Structure formats: C-alpha cells, structure tokens
Amino acid sequence: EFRVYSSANNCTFEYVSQPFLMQGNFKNLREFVFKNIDGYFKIYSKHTPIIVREPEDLPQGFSALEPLVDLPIGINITRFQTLLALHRS
Amino acid sequence: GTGVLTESNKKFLPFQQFGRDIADTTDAVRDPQTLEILDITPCSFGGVSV
Ligand SMILES: *[C@@H]1O[C@H](CO)[C@@H](O)[C@H](O)[C@H]1NC(C)=O
Ligand SMILES: *[C@@H]1O[C@H](CO)[C@@H](O)[C@H](O)[C@H]1NC(C)=O
Ligand SMILES: *[C@@H]1O[C@H](CO)[C@@H](O)[C@H](O)[C@H]1NC(C)=O
Numbered sequence: 565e566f567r568v569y570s571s572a573n574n575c576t577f578e579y580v581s582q583p584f585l586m587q588g589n590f591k592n593l594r595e596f597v598f599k600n601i602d603g604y605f606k607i608y609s610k611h612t613p614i615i616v617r618e619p620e621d622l623p624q625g626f627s628a629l630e631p632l633v634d635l636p637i638g639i640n641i642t643r644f645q646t647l648l649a650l651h652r653s
Numbered sequence: 654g655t656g657v658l659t660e661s662n663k664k665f666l667p668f669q670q671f672g673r674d675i676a677d678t679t680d681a682v683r684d685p686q687t688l689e690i691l692d693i694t695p696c697s698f699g700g701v702s703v
Binding site: 630631632 | 666
C-alpha cells in the first residue's frame with residue numbers, strides 16, 4: 565500500500581532492485597550518503613550489525629561506504645525530508 | 654598497450670572496474686564479458702651493455 569502520494573505525472577526513468585536495503589536486541593546501522601555532483605545523483609550505503617548501547621549513539625568505529633546506485637537526474641535538490649512507516653496495531 | 658595478462662588474486666569490489674598504481678598506471682583490469690580480474694604486467698625488458 566502507498567500513502568505518501570495519490571497521483572503522478574510525466575517523469576524520468578525508474579530503477580528497481582529485486583532484493584532490499586533491509587535474541588533480537590542486536591541493533592543495526594544503515595548509513596547513507598546522498599551526493600549531487602556534475603548532474604549524477606550518487607548514493608552510497610553500508611550495513612553493519614552493532615552492539616546495543618545505552619545512549620543509542622553513533623558507534624566508535626570506522627566503516628567505509630560503497631556505491632550502490634547512480635542516477636543522472638536532478639536540477640535543484642536543495643531540500644529534502646524523510647518518510648517513516650508506523651505499525652497500526 | 655602491451656603486457657602479459659594472467660589471473661590475479663586481487664579481491665576487486667563489484668562496483669570497481671580498473672586498478673591503478675602510484676604513477677596512475679593501470680595494473681589490473683576487469684574483463685567486460687566474463688567476471689574475471691586480470692593483471693597488466695610487461696613481459697620482459699632491460700638494458701643492453703656491450
Ligand atoms: C513533464 O515534462 C515537462 C516538459 O516541459 C517538464 O517541464 C515537467 O517537469 C515534467 N514533469 C511533470 C510535469 O511532472
Ligand atoms: C534553486 O533554488 C534556489 C532557491 O529556491 C534558487 O536560489 C536557485 O537559483 C535555484 N537553482 C536553479 C538552478 O534553479
Ligand atoms: C555473450 O553473448 C553471447 C551471444 O550469444 C552469449 O552466447 C554468451 O553467453 C554471452 N556471454 C556472457 C558472459 O554474457
């Protein structure tokens with residue numbers, strides 16, 4: 565189901581991946597970098613399981629980020645937001 | 654260029670295609686057809702003294 569939109573219009577190419585970018589208390593770490601240079605909209609990502617901490621802050625470590633997708637789309641991208649999904653019980 | 658192409662054991666990342674050196678000289682290259690990592694090394698050369 566989709567709730568963030570109701571309609572669309574004419575736009576550019578769409579890319580699609582078959583997998584996903586996704587006791588049980590062991591937290592994870594999903595780092596992302598959205599850089600827009602020379603027209604190409606580059607995106608980096610790297611996942612690593614981290615130990616659950618008390619303050620739930622950034623772990624004291626080092627992990628390189630690897631590219632996973634490149635899109636030659638974008639004209640003026642000086643704004644962005646985020647989207648979450650709540651579990652309706 | 655020119656050089657012997659052998660099967661190298663360089664653990665190339667998926668998004669990586671080429672491999673350079675200190676002098677920006679290509680040492681390894683990924684085969685476009687098959688997923689294989691070769692290496693570019695000249696065969697033999699040296700000075701000649703008489
Ligand atoms: C549709 O194409 C026009 C072409 O002029 C473009 O200006 C517009 O941004 C595109 N997307 C829309 C209308 O959502
Ligand atoms: C992008 O938007 C900002 C503010 O809305 C504006 O100052 C700037 O000129 C815009 N750039 C382009 C290329 O449209
Ligand atoms: C290359 O293309 C030919 C064309 O028929 C095909 O038979 C072959 O399996 C392809 N090889 C690879 C590695 O894609």
